[PDB]
């Protein structure tokens, strides 16, 4: 059970069935997906991205480690991704607003997470706030790890969907906007736990009532699960 793609090996682990690499793939997952989103929505210019292979089928622009700014943003997502190791990360989302730092978003690219108790089969419960089941829970809990190649296809689906939404579906962003990364901790995460680069906040983000959405794709490595969605006012 391994991903034998020659290109895949550079950015990703060849094996995603064990806890460490399952969590590590997620970190690499966050990095690639949000790189494509930032690039294809033209939040950042080309010069912050390095052309990379995901598979022999698909290329992608990933945040450049050799540019000052893009390296900071890559580091930011790497910290968020590392929190996946102990099940401390509920959600990371690229949040676009009119002004820094509005609560209600114009557009949001969200990755939402779920962790599994042991063997990577039974899902750890993820709740409100009020005790209510999380919106992204059911869909991800029903899933079963189907091998490394299934995960490879999921990563390809996500990046291709990201490219599709920005190229064919989404209206352009305004001349003036502010885009920042906002995350949510799991309840399991202790008070002593904080993710570098992210300020503590009592507020997250909100969406207008008339918000439209689209599913970018899901991820099911051996011991983790994620769903990526696009929320925006600029569809069609």
């Amino acid at each position: 059970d391994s991903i034998d793609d020659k290109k895949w090996s550079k950015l990703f682990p060849r094996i995603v069935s064990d806890p460490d690499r399952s969590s590590n793939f997620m970190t690499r997952a966050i990095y690639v997906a949000f790189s494509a989103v930032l690039r294809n929505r033209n939040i950042l210019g080309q010069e912050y991205f390095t052309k990379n292979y995901i598979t022999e089928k698909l290329k992608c622009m990933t945040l450049c480690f050799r540019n000052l700014r893009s390296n900071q943003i890559a580091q930011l997502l790497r910290n968020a991704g590392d929190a996946t190791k102990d099940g401390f990360l509920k959600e990371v989302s690229l949040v676009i607003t009119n002004n820094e730092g509005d609560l209600e978003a114009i557009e949001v690219f969200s990755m939402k997470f779920i962790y599994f108790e042991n063997g990577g089969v039974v899902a750890r419960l993820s709740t409100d706030k009020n005790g209510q089941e999380d919106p992204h829970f059911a869909k991800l809990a029903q899933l079963v790890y189907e091998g490394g190649d299934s995960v490879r296809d999921q990563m390809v689906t996500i990046v291709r969907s990201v490219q599709f939404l920005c190229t064919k579906v989404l209206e352009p962003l305004p001349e003036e906007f502010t885009a920042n990364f906002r995350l949510e901790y799991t309840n399991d995460a202790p008070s002593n736990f904080r993710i570098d680069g992210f300020e503590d906040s009592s507020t997250f983000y909100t969406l207008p009532d008339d918000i439209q959405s689209a599913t970018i794709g899901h991820l099911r490595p051996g011991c983790h699960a994620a769903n990526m969605e696009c929320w925006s006012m600029l569809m069609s």
């Binding site: 502010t178 920042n180 906002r182």
Partner: peptide, 14 residues
């Protein structure tokens, strides 16, 4: 130290 469930990063502004 942290009594809040949310994290905010510095952003990119155009």
């Amino acid at each position: 130290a942290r009594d809040s469930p949310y994290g905010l990063s510095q952003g990119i502004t155009k």
